């Protein structure tokens, strides 16, 4: 009924009403970095 990944998290599931398999891919994420000249020069920043 359920599949699992190395972390024991759910990898895929079988839909309980219609028996098809759905992959579960966690929603996009990532670190956010701010690129900035010192604030003694400018308050403009770029975001990575």
């Amino acid at each position: 009924q359920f599949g699992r990944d190395i972390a024991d998290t759910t990898d895929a599931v079988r839909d309980p009403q219609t028996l098809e398999i759905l992959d579960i891919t966690p929603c996009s994420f990532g670190g956010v970095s701010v690129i900035t000249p010192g604030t003694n020069t400018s308050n403009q920043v770029a975001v990575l």
Partner: peptide, 23 residues
Amino acid sequence: PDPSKPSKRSFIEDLLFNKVTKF
């Protein structure tokens, strides 16, 4: 360096790169 490659590496360097290999 070998000018014919997509990355100008030498013959020997290519050999080295071909030997060393969530949510």
